[PDB]
Amino acid sequence: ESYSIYVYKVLKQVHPDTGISSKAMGIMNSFVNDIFERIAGEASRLAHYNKRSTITSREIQTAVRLLLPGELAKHAVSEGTKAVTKYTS
Amino acid sequence: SRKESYSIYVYKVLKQVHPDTGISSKAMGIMNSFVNDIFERIAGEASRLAHYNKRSTITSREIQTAVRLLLPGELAKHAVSEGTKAVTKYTS
Amino acid sequence: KTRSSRAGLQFPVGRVHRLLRKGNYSERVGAGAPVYLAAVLEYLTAEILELAGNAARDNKKTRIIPRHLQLAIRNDEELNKLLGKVTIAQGGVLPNIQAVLLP
Amino acid sequence: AKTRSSRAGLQFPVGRVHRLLRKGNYSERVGAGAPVYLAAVLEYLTAEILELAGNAARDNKKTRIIPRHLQLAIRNDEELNKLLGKVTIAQGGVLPNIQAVLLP
Amino acid sequence: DNIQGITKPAIRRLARRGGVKRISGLIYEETRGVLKVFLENVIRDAVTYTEHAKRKTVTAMDVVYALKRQGRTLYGFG
Amino acid sequence: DNIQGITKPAIRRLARRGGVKRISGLIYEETRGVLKVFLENVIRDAVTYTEHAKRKTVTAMDVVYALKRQGRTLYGFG
Amino acid sequence: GGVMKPHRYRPGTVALREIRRYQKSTELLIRKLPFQRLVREIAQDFKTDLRFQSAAIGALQEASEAYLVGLFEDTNLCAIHAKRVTIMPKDIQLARRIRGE
Amino acid sequence: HRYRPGTVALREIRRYQKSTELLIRKLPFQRLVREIAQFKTDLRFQSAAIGALQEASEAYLVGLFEDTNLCAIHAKRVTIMPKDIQLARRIRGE
Amino acid sequence: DDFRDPQRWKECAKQGKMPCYFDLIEENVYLTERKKNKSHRDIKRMQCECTPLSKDERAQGEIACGEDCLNRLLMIECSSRCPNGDYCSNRRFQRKQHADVEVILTEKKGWGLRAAKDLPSNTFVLEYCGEVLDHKEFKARVKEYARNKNIHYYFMALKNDEIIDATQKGNCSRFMNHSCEPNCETQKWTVNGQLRVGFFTTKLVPSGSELTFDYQFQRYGKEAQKCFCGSANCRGYLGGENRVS
DNA sequence: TGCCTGGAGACTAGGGAGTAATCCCCTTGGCGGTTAAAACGCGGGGGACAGCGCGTACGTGCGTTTAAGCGGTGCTAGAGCTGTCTACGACCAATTGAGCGGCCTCGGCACCGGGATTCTCG
DNA sequence: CGAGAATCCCGGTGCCGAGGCCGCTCAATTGGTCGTAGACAGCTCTAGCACCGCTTAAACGCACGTACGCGCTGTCCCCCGCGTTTTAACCGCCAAGGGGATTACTCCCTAGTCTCCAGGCA
Ligand SMILES: C[S@@+](CC[C@H](N)C(=O)[O-])C[C@H]1O[C@@H](n2cnc3c(N)ncnc32)[C@H](O)[C@@H]1O
Ligand SMILES: [Zn+2]
Ligand SMILES: [Zn+2]
Ligand SMILES: [Zn+2]
């Protein structure tokens, strides 16, 4: 079980008439897993320093702002904020 | 508020290998930071080893494997020997 | 309906919530964290695939290869900073020759 | 009512290490020999670094141990320099080292 | 303009501790920029931890965590 | 002596990929020792993971975990 | 009446042509069976009677080639800073000293 | 009475590799930190935070001048130059 | 004096005023060409790295792909996929940009060429074109043709196994002579994956001066020949008792 | 396409976090005095840089040799997946002693000054 | 080789931080019950190892020539040791008050359980 069909769903939206090899699919799988592990580990570190027992969207946002570069983190925070705003409204 | 430390234990270790030698507060803080850092490294490596084999319990075998990966040279041999000697005496 | 249809995303939310509850990170997990993290992962995936598609169209190809991923990552200022310690298999290097060697 | 440190023959505590293992989000279960093994390893490393620190304190004609003595004790041993190669010690200074081409 | 407060004898004493026998006249403007970049990175991480902690005071553990994040691992301040 | 199986034109070809125009005569004997030390470290950690996992075959995920332990993340063999 | 040869290339042209040719491609530059024999020989020192897969040796070869290419990329900068073109072992030792190895 | 150039330099190398004190003053460094921490307006600092920043900054600068001296010796010179600092920060990975 | 006309005429052998006893030739022809080469697997394209403008010529206009190109320095002509397109100046073997040549008599050593007008250094003159042989046919045709009592042998070794004959068909580069003071030479250019031999100049040759190239000296039989130029250090004969190829 | 295993929909309890109050510790601002350190010239010796000459080590090229690939076949150690069950860890009740905080006390070490030794250079 | 600036040694004074001692909490200890995680056994089947014949592309070795690394010499710029003057760092003291930190109360958010049913993997 992997993220391959979801990588196809993302790829067919930004470039319609293109394909992708299985080696590049494995590299994208490793990239998604690595970024997941980095963000989850930093959000696990942030929740221990304040003696809290819950990882929240504020914890994930603080782990995004520490890890990503300047122009990338702003768009990541904006996309995540829009997605968590559309979840309740 | 009451806070954990390792100062009395570092003093008990120091008064066995050097019977006439003092220690300052800065050196005691450096020793506390050293003990905390090595604890965090070994515990994190053992918790990483516990997830690869799909286990749930961290035991002395995972702790020994985390020590063997992390310490270089003959220091790992002596650490494994001291730990095995201390675990062997505990069961009896 | 699924929560990925509620949030409007493409990456799943239940699998991310299961991996948060399963991988020993904390005691409790909230409600906006897998949605937020799925949005971040979808944005990063779309950026990598956009630059890879541009690098694939620049060489008259229709299939993205690890060389195209290598050129897309190393020809960007911030993705090279994020992925500086990562070795991509079958990726190669960037073509460059120092100016004190050319005749 | 003997403790577990007296039963294991160690100087570091066992219940504090067990509490820090159970309250640190490392795993669901914790074995009964792991804090004994880890306290033995930490006690060995503590005695190993304090021997070299006491040797430096005897070499510099002092009674107490200072961060300069700790810096000399770590940087004069090769295995401790490899284990602690990314560690900065406050008020520890550097090592005396002058290259052979800079001096006549 | 407080980067000019890192004077020439201070950089010269740091180079004498570093083992440097003879020093040119252009090292100082490079050293001030390198020090400025390093301090901007560490102060940015420390202010990010402080803003997450809902506090107005930047403590020392925030600085130790900001140095641990970059791989420096300073001992002596907790 | 299978260290001599890493031939001279292979090291020359790696230097041509690295951007080197002209090569001396001791770079090959230096590169063999460097490669030997690196491979000994990675094989030591991989065999440690394999002996911990109670197996007898050395898989590729053990190599990926050892390279992650050295600090060199490898995408593709997961 | 003899058959004359045209000319001979100046030293450096074929070398820069090979630099472009091997920076354009993406392939394995080392033979596979001597590398496999070397890995098995140095792995006999840690555990007798082991067994290997194929991706486990392929990943080692990818990591080793990337490491050596990065080492030569820093070592060429060392040799250019030393105001030379030929690459010396002292440049390799300087690169491994400044890098932290 | 004058000394040949280099004796006082080696004397300073010996005495500052023997000493352990701080070389940068405290009020200019504190004003530099409080200037460049303006990120978030109207902050507040403990003393140990600046005391840790100064230790880390001077350790970083000494560790950079060591490799600068190594590059200058490799270039068969004695005087350090900014290109040696650039080579050290290029090989170091910055 | 050249007067290339397709009708065969009444001049026996010397080819100084009537060029239609033999046949001329375009780009060379092959006999046993097989698809084992580095043609379209790694030398598919070798594109230069140029960021041109190409909209400002004849006024603040630099010529495209000059002596700063990556391909001209490495003795490679560009393909049709160039970023300059049909304005690149590397493609000189394909657009047939030649030099003004003429064939008349200069000395009793034989026929040759003399420069019409001024011609600067590193300027292309003519391409060596002929018939490409192979392994077996060379050592049979040389002993079949040595017994025909010919003076001129039009053999040039492209590689260790390829020798080009310019006897049955030849272009205007077959008349050029030998001298111990060379002003032109030969280079090995790689066009479309295939190796080709050209002729460049080295100095500022005046209008009405000789254009010869240096032979890499070679004997094949027992006899010897000598040169008649005598510039300053003319050996004439070969380099001793050598026997290499 | 089969299907089945993981994801969604309600409902409830309990403790985790959010708000308000108040103490008092520690951060910031200010004024003066001393003097150590930074700033500014100045003469000069040393080193960085440029030019030139020479010998050799490393490049390109050709012919011979060798073993890396490339298929085909066969045998088997060992990875992988279910079943039993038993021993080991989580959890709670009661208890007591080890360790954190506060308080005196004295001695290792830091500053100062005199006398003699050790490297430096013209 | 002998003036001359650093430098080591010896003693005296005194002071503030390391260390012993005590009172007292709260967390380690011991006993007992229950559930379930892994240890062992056993069956299947699959890639890993070993051998064999053929081809041909890469490695090796020798010849030769020339561009470059290294050594020497000359010049002139520029950094260093030293002396004098100016400046703000450091210590000491004082005072206002802002926010860390702790406690008490209360709402509400997510883990757990049961039922249902479709999304994606071979
Ligand atoms: C390319 S042709 C050059 C001139 C040729 N004879 C012509 O008129 O076209 C080469 C042949 O001419 C002969 N040749 C060229 N130069 C010569 C010379 N200087 N002395 C003697 N023979 C020469 C050689 O023997 C060779 O076989
Ligand atoms: Zn071009
Ligand atoms: Zn072009
Ligand atoms: Zn001649």
Numbering used by the authors:
A (entry chain H): 35 to 123
B (entry chain D): 32 to 123
C (entry chain G): 15 to 117
D (entry chain C): 14 to 117
E (entry chain F), F (entry chain B): 24 to 101
G (entry chain A): 33 to 133
H (entry chain E): 39 to 76, 78 to 133
I (entry chain L): 1452 to 1696
Lines quoted from the article behind this entry:
Tri-methylation of histone H3 on lysine 36 (H3K36me3), primarily deposited by histone methyltransferase (HMT) SETD2 in mammalian cells, occurs at gene bodies of active chromatin and serves as one of the essential histone marks associated with active transcription. Substitution of lysine 36 with methionine in histone H3.3 (H3.3K36M) is an oncogenic mutation that inhibits SETD2-mediated histone H3K36 tri-methylation in tumors. Set2 is the sole H3K36 methyltransferase that carries out mono-, di- and tri-methylation of H3K36 in yeast. The cryo-EM structures of human SETD2 and its yeast homolog Set2 complexed with the H3K36M nucleosome also provide an evolutionarily conserved structural framework for the recognition of nucleosome by the histone H3K36 methyltransferases.
Cryo-EM single-particle analysis generated a global density map of the SETD2–hNCPH3.3K36M complex at a resolution of 3.1 Å. The catalytic domain of SETD2 binds to the N-terminal α helix (α-N) of histone H3.3 as well as the nucleosome DNA at superhelix location 1 (SHL1), at which the histone H3.3 tail snuggly extends through the substrate-binding channel of SETD2. Notably, only the catalytic domain of SETD2 could be unambiguously built in the cryo-EM map of the SETD2–hNCPH3.3K36M complex, which suggests that the rest of SETD2 regions might adopt flexible conformations on the mutant nucleosome. At the interface, the side chains of Tyr41, Arg49 and Arg52 from histone H3 stick out and form a hydrogen-bonding network with the main chain carbonyls of Gln1498, Leu1525, Lys1639 as well as the side chain of Asn1522 from SETD2AWS. In vitro HMT assays of SETD2 showed that a nucleosome mutant with substitutions of Arg49H3.3 and Arg52H3.3 with glutamic acids (R49E&R52E) failed to be methylated by SETD2, which underscores the importance of these residues in SETD2-mediated H3K36 tri-methylation. At the active site of SETD2, residues Val35, Met36 and Lys37 of the H3.3 tail, sandwiched within an intermolecular β-sheet structure, are stabilized through main-chain contacts with the Phe1606–Met1607–Ala1608 and Gln1667–Phe1668–Gln1669 strands of SETD2.
